[PDB]
Amino acid sequence: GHQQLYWSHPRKFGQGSRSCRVCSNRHGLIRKYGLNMCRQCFRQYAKDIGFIKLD
Amino acid sequence: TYRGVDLDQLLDMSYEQLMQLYSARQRRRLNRGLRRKQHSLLKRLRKAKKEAPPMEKPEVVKTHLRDMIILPEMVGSMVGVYNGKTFNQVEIKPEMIGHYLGEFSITYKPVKHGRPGIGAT
Amino acid sequence: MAVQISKKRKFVADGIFKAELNEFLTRELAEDGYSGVEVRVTPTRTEIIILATRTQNVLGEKGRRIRELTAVVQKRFGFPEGSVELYAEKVATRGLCAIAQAESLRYKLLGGLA
Amino acid sequence: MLMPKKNRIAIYELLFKEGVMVAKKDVHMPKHPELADKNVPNLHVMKAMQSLKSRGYVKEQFAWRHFYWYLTNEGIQYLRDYLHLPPEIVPATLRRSR
Amino acid sequence: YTTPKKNKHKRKKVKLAVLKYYKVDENGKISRLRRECPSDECGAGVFMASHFDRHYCGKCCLTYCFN
Amino acid sequence: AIHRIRITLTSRNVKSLEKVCADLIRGAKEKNLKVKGPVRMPTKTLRITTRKTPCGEGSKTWDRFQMRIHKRLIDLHSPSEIVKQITSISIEPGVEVEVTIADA
RNA sequence: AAGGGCACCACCAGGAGUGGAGCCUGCGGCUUAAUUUGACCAACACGGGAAACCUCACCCGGCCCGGACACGGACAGGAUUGACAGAUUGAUAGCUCUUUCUCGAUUCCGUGGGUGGUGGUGCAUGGCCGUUCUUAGUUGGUGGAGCGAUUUGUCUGGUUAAUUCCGAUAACGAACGAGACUCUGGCAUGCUAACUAGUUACGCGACCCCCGAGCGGUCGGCGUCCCCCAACUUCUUAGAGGGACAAGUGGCGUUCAGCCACCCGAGAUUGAGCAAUAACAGGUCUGUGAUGCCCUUAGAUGUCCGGGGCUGCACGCGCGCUACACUGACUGGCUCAGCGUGUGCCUACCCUACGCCGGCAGGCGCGGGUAACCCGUUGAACCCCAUUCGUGAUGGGGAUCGGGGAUUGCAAUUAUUCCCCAUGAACGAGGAAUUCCCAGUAAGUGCGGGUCAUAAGCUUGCGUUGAUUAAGUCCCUGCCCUUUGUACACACCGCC
Ligand SMILES: [Mg+2]
């Protein structure tokens, strides 16, 4: 359809409004500290950001 | 009699003072702006009622929006409410005012319990 | 103040930038013997230092490819213009870089070697 | 792609004025961040660059959620004779201060 | 599948010939037989529609209805 | 000018912060400014707990991560002006610095 | 089968329970157009899976191409695109139709060829992670033996949590794991520093005694980093260090490796993280622009939009919460925490002091806080002290259900949540069975974070109160090492 209904449904909040900043996944997001990264992607890159294991 | 006043007074009961006769949820609904879809549906029912023959019920009008709250000016219309599969035509009784349209087109049929299968050993 | 975010969010954003830049350099400099990324940030400007083996390969004709990557990192993260510089550094003892050796092994396997 | 000329030339000259261009993967983005005044949707520029890659005038690199198109040497003369330009004006990456 | 409705017929355009909806007479006298869209975004170059009960501007999308 | 400034340093490791907090104040004493004592703020520990598995099947083992952010406050105060005196920051990568004044 | 050692995912002695009742939640089954699906110690409050839309992958319908590139037709005398009205549509989808305007080379058609897919395949795979197995075990070289598969090394014994070490020794020299290591808690009146942490002293004050004290008592009242206009770091923070080693004494011990008791000491075993070889057709292609092969790709298994469902109930099961009360409930008063969060690239959405309105849920204006600067000295619960209740399904219990009032959102119905007044159901300690646990431990008790536009019965942590029992054993359930039997080797869930 035209622009009046193609993206008409609001996504200004809710689970569909948020996606992973790496793989654009819509499940298991980590919004803490504005990380905005998927759980799998965070485990993949936590050494790179700097979250290292201590205990 | 919705709140002690008759239906005739409800027909000319404007929205601003009608919210003091609805419940809290309906009053909050009407306090927020009704979108263009609801206004279009209201115009459609008005058109159907005015074009309806005298002493005879109007024609059926269909809709997906079942979150519409019932207004007194829609009494007597033939409205077909979607249930997820088909449109269910339903009367607007003079007792249905504070109730949403979705309550009168069930989204499931009631279960007829049969013999249990392999489970629950 | 209000314009600047909290320190925790700032460190998180720095880590995000580091990881994203590392991923971009990995996917872009895979055939150029990429080793790793080192960034030096100052309030004046930022300095990004790439560790790689073939500096002459990552650098295009008269530094064409290094200019291309500098423009890419300028555009994507929205730095102030001229506040980022890209240095390509030749690594020491490239046999000690597991990234470079793994990429070389992948290159060998893609070549058809057993 | 049904996108018009008036933004096609704009995207093309942005792509030629500097050797690269960066586009986030979001087909529903109302506006591409740079070239702000032209009011060009992001899907149009994404598919224009896809067509250019298909014809081989640009090569594409993909990070997490971004494209990193690199204009190639076959992209020089195509943009030149599409924009009707003499071979003296170069992208910034090609010639600097020389 | 087995869609209960038949496949929806997509519109095919009328394949209009040369426009020629304007005429001059006795060795040249302009006769606008189509309505003018007066807005700036329409301009004075384009003409309006000639519907049986209204006029429509292709660009300005205004509707002048005559009763 | 009469200037009294504040210098804050923060990073993720303690060795770099300590060596900066040492050499900077030593340079200040060699450059004869009196220095307000270094204030080590309480550490911000950023904890993230995440299931190790990417699927959910397993023994419910949670992976926990940390990020120790240490920040130090040093105030450089001189009877005369400061900024024209000291300009060299001498800052290695990995540590952040913000230079403010008493008014700021 | 024997011998030795070991474990509260085993037992003993106990504690708390579960299973008995209600409710929440997840599986199966039933029903459904659809109740998307995986997973069956090592699945069943798991997929960080607390779904109104989105999520969505399921169903009922409607659009768009977001089908590149190439070839050939098509066309500026129009390839083709948008759209007002009416009908039509759930729809103000020009989606289709009547009807004409308008964009102009970007498209259209067909042929190949893309491409995409939460489509399939974890029994094709990468990666991840779980389990074997957190037990202490594992391997190379050289040498010895055996025709060889293999064996010694890698052990009689003693010791340890530990093939941990001492000791013998056809072995020698190694290597991983364990250990070692990092964080954590416990002592540092030792050092450094402190207006974004305090203390002490002093000066203003304010109130009581003022009989009379007066350098009397209290102040989280104001001040002395306002720059000359006090000192100090114990309390707080975080760095550098120290500190504990079976070190000292007695005993046991081949007096070796070690073991028991005790003084001094803060501490004589703080909890974690990492964690070998080999393996599972263990789980994930529904995390990925990780991905092979197959399927679809224009009436779409793409994508978007509307709605419904994922909650649906004769029933079984799992984890939980609430309780069955007087060691209690209610009412009032008094009184102490610690993790840790707080305004955002897309992305709109923060923590909130204080003042006013309302009975409450909430609303109305002034601010603070991007943070040891404000919430906050986080005035928490439990508990403590007083009132009432009185052994009753009772003032325990609040399930079910009626009405009304607010919050968030586009939308609250299949009730989002909250508040008020109504009803008070089972339940009176729970069969056979069964879970977890040795000191700040179980358990009682609240508080943060995750999910959150709105939200916790879940989870991760934090703090408060705070124990009984035990310092053993192999009885069950298992594990390691040695010997032994084997007709097993997909390895006793075997073979026959
Ligand atoms: Mg009562």
Ligand SMILES: [Mg+2]
């Ligand atoms: Mg025999």
